[PDB]
Amino acid sequence: PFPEGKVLDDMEGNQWVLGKKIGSGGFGLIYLAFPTNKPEKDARHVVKVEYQENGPLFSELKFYQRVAKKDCIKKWIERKQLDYLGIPLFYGSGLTEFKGRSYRFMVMERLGIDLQKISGQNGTFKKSTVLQLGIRMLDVLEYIHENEYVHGDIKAANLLLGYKNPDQVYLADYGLSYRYCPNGNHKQYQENPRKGHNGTIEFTSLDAHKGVALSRRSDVEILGYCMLRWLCGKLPWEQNLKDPVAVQTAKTNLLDELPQSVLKWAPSGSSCCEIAQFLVCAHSLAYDEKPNYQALKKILNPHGIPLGPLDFSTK
Ligand SMILES: CC(C)CCN1c2nc(Nc3cc(F)c(O)c(F)c3)ncc2N(C)C(=O)[C@@H]1C
């Protein structure tokens, strides 16, 4: 349906030539892509194409149009004095056709390998890497939250290294993202069972379990379960993933028994001291409360050591 050599036209008039299909990402097929004007030998762009009616690409497109502006991001980076922000570049979008049916596509920045492929036994990472990933994610979280959105699906499969830079990590899918504060108006707290248990069950927030519209605290919470999983190689609810209520109950039990619940869970020699503190910080937020990003980062980097290379020596 999208053979190598297919020419796609974006809304800005630019043309893109499809290369090899490198996989599926989110609710899309991912292809290497080249501009028709001065292409490099090695692709620096991808085309994300929908393969189904409706889908979350429209929602993801709107997220990029609203918060992922090159200009705005660079200005943010300048003001916050960051080396980089783990959000891929958006290049354009449009429609492509196959057998009289239209499909939405987006042209995105080509990234490197996803974190699931370079993990140690049962999807683990070195303690130092785990903490740096959290910090990078918090920076991304701070930016999108300031721009009225919450992610709702942070997991190793959604984290990829930079194409040219292996010491940079990117959160690469925003299909489940949500506008929690449209025009500066935070959503009210309201539970809804019929809209409950969304997201990746292993990592989804308790708010998600209860059918509550996602807010900033849910994002921080997910990041916390993520880090515990990356450092320990399992979660107390690993054998209960097919029962969402059992997972919710186990998450409530973990948070209610903090910090000893997390402090005992860790494997010997690699403490969950920072992560327990992080979770304590994360679980103390009110529903509409802005997270203390700076305080969370200091919990993950208590000695203020500069962020260096990402160590993936257990792969
Ligand atoms: C969708 C993710 C979770 C997985 C997609 N993904 C890659 N995506 C990109 N760029 C990309 C793709 C997207 F959909 C984006 O929205 C985006 F902002 C950037 N480069 C390289 C890869 N590589 C090598 C992979 O292994 C897989 C296929």
Residue numbers in the entry: 14 to 328
Paper text:
For both VRK13-364 and VRK214-335, the compound inducing the largest ΔTm shift was BI-D1870, a dihydropteridinone inhibitor originally developed for p90 RSK (ribosomal S6 kinase)32 which displayed more substantial temperature stabilization than the best PKIS hit for VRK13-364, GW297361X (5.5 versus 3.9 °C in this experiment, respectively). Nevertheless, the most complete polypeptide chain in this model contains an intact P-loop (chain A, residues 22–341; used for the structural comparisons below). BI-D1870 adopts a non-planar conformation that complements well the ATP-binding site of VRK2. However, the VRK2/BI-D1870 co-structure revealed this protein favors a particular enantiomer of BI-D1870 (S-form) and that the methyl group attached to the stereogenic center projects into a cavity formed by the hydrophobic side chains from P-loop residues. The pendant isopentyl group in the bicyclic core is orthogonal to the plane of the ring in a configuration that allows Gly39 from the P-loop to approach Asp186 in the DYG motif, closing the P-loop over the compound 3,5-difluoro-4-hydroxyphenyl ring. Structural comparisons of ligand-bound and apo-VRK2 structures reveal the isopentyl moiety also orients the side chain of Asp186 towards the catalytic lysine. For example, the gatekeeper methionine is displaced and the catalytic lysine re-positions itself to become the focal point in a network of polar contacts that also involves the phenol of BI-D1870 and the side chains of Asp186 and that from the conserved glutamate residue in αC, Glu73. Thus, the folded conformation of the P-loop in VRK2 seems to be driven mostly by shape complementarity and hydrophobic contacts between the protein and the compound, whereas in VRK1 the P-loop folded conformation is held in place by a direct interaction between the ligand sulfur atom and the protein aromatic residue.
Members of the Vaccinia-related kinase (VRK) family of serine/threonine protein kinases are present in the genomes of all metazoans and those of poxviruses, including the family-founding member vaccinia virus B1R1–6. Here we present the first crystal structures of the kinase domain of VRK1 and the first crystal structures for ligand-bound VRK1 and VRK2. Ligand-bound VRK kinase domains adopt the canonical protein kinase fold, except for the presence of the additional α-helix between αC and β4 (αC4) exclusively found on VRK proteins. The ligand-bound structures obtained here for active VRKs are in a closed, active conformation and display the same overall organization previously observed for the apo-structures, including the position of the VRK-exclusive αC4 and the structural organization of conserved residues that make up the kinase hydrophobic spine36.
